[PDB]
């Protein structure tokens, strides 16, 4: 579940959580010291006080206006004093409850509503990045390991588990927020008392040890970032990104963990009405030290090249074809995706740059190509792939990739336009580099198809492409497209320098799709429509957790998409269906039937 | 209380003085330890090493945390009670009788 | 509610016993019986709530 | 707590004797009752703490 929104880096959510923490500090509770006061006894105590003050006042008026002056009046005084003791206890409890209900509850419910409203988007972003990091870690191997890596895992697993569980639990108990509201406040206060309790093994201790293991202040001077980079850099790991992007994603996930932990800690200390400590300083210190560790001791030793993550056995016709993967004037290629669900297709992302290689979210055009398998794979008569890794200098961004399969050989040419780092404009100063001749590699003819690349070919965040190269392994009959990114520069200039960062993530979905609400996730079919009272939204149906369109008798669900098309231009249709369907791309005027 | 607070601040400063006088030696020796540890990138992990690490890392982590945080707070120190909040919380969590104290 | 009932019942018993031990005036005893009946109503409400809790 | 209770019980008894044996019947006496009641609240808190400590 990707998100088309500027992911502001560690600086982004760090400053967001700092603002939330300052706001929490600004919230005034007052006499929030009587926590052990059942708020569900307000009516009981109020009734008792109202019914007892009358008797107390009756006795007072009797002893005052009364003309009796004797030890009998002294006994009446003692009786009135005992009634006064009972009434005063009841009234103290009632006053505490009323203060807590009319000063301590509204402030905190508003504060927690704001906290959750602000944590929403951060949680979305960091959850997507956590999914990606978990995929990477699944692709890792920790069976035959080094002593330092093993020590880092030993030292970081308990604190990681604790912090993750506490963050998730606090988020759940806040979203939980009558008797239900009071029970939820009681649960929140229990969690806060547990988080803030004074013990050396407290939540704060685990936070500090997590930081010490992230920076390398453990037994062996080994930072978790170094072991992460060492595990992710090995040859076995095949991911959709470079080492820079993968270790930066690791850092993002763990720093977001820490920041949310500090936020929960502040919220708990405020909920319990405890002395403030201002963890913004400590949060910033930790995050900045970890970013500096990454920038100094980790980032320089990483490779900013990303290749194909997967391979697929396929065949391709020997019919010669020209392909030109180009970007519109002023745009730049920032990523690709080879998908072969049923047919081989290539998504290509184009976007204008803004500054320091930042990609523009508004300009994120997506083009589609279909003749990639017939171009990268031979059918029956061998193939000759020219292989050469191009590497343009800095300030040059690839714009065109020209594949020409004149004969049974494959030869690509790349063009790179000059890009000004200060501004966001790409001038028309072009450098053209081809696949050098002396280094070609031949795949012999084989009945079994060759292994075409497959997967997402792009950095963890869409960045310009510096160089592009093809490689072919004859023994394994593999083909790889290795591109080079500018993520190191974009990070050194925006995030690792504590400046406004703007990063986009590969959408993992055909943005160029012309069928609005194709996945049919919005329950209200404003785009689609039903002609007759049937064929409705079957929520149980669809790709696992979605809302499929359904048809029963003779009423078919239709959607108008005539305008967003072109004449005689090729198109690709795709759809999942269950049962005995009938799909038709039909024109009301004329009986022409495009797809049936 | 007014004769207590300054006396305790002076005592903490006098402690930190000699503590820092000592800390330089162990800092250099731990630097040498880290130098020898960097060479462990080629020694694979054995069951004995795995067990010893998994057994010592909790106590070591907690002891190092307590020591370094006490030093940090005593250095930051140099009503006052509002400033000694972290030090008092640390002292209350460190001198507490517990099953896992 | 148990503590409240105990204290209120002790107060009411002390009052009633001390006023029955020696009756002095008409208006005084009248007002004493009035406030004692009010205290008895309060104690009855407290005991009703306590018995409701016990039944729960 | 024992010193505080021993020193406040005298004032409480003085106020009680003043309001009882005294022939004043006015809102002045009502305010004196309020004052005695506040002093009695303080004394009762002190005495509850002292009783708990003595029992323990």
Author numbering:
A (entry chain D): 14 to 190, 202 to 620
B (entry chain A): 114 to 191, 204 to 226
C (entry chain C), D (entry chain B): 58 to 113
Give verbatim excerpts from the published study on this entry.
In addition, Bt secretes to the medium numerous vegetative insecticidal proteins (Vip) that have been classified into three different families. To shed light on some of these questions, we have determined the near-atomic resolution structures of Vip3Aa in the protoxin and activated states by cryo-electron microscopy (cryo-EM).
The cryo-EM structure of the protoxin reveals key insights into the molecular architecture of the protein, and shows that Vip3 is composed of five distinct domains, confirming earlier predictions. The first helix is markedly amphipathic, and the second and third helices form an antiparallel bundle that adopts a different configuration in the outer (chains A and C) and inner monomers (chains B and D). In particular, the variable length of the α1–α2 loop allows the second and third helices of the internal monomers to rotate ∼90° compared with the external ones. This rotation further increases the curvature and tension of this element and leads to the formation of an eight-helix bundle that protrudes as a stalk from the tetrameric core formed by the subsequent domain. Notably, this second domain, composed of five α helices, embodies the core of the tetramer and plays a structural role mainly through two extended loops (comprising residues 221–226 and 239–247, respectively) that project toward the adjacent subunit and stabilize the Vip3 oligomer. In sharp contrast, the C-terminal region of Vip3 is composed of three globular domains that are mostly solvent exposed and do not show any interactions between different monomers.
